[PDB]
């Protein structure tokens, strides 16, 4: 198939674990998907972004502890995440899976 189009949004509000919560966010840029942006990589087990479910693997994460994540380079992102709070906030995308195929392996050997 193809598929095309946008979808709906949904919010993420997990508590900052002893680990710093458990999502391995990159840039869009060096994931295949070559775009600007940060998405979902991974997903740590004794983690509470994987604790959550909902995380998915590719997400494209969009706000931060109600931080807008328009522009805000990788590790402002990042920095935003790391100095969060005891509640983290995250406003992530329904993605495809062929997005979270860039991210992990995507399409065309290679």
Not at 14 to 41: C, W
Not at 77 to 96: C, N, T
């Amino acid at each position: 198939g193809s598929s095309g189009s946008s979808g709906y949004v949904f919010t993420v509000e997990l508590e900052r674990g002893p680990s710093g919560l458990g999502m391995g966010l990159i840039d869009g840029m060096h994931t295949h998907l070559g775009a600007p942006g940060l998405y979902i990589q991974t997903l740590l087990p004794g983690s509470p972004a994987a604790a959550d479910g909902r995380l998915s693997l590719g997400d494209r994460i969009l706000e931060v502890n109600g931080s807008s994540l328009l522009g805000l380079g990788y590790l402002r992102a990042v920095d935003l995440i790391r100095h969060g709070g005891k509640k983290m906030r995250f406003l992530v995308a329904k993605s495809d899976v062929e997005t979270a195929k860039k991210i992990h392996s995507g399409p065309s050997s290679g």
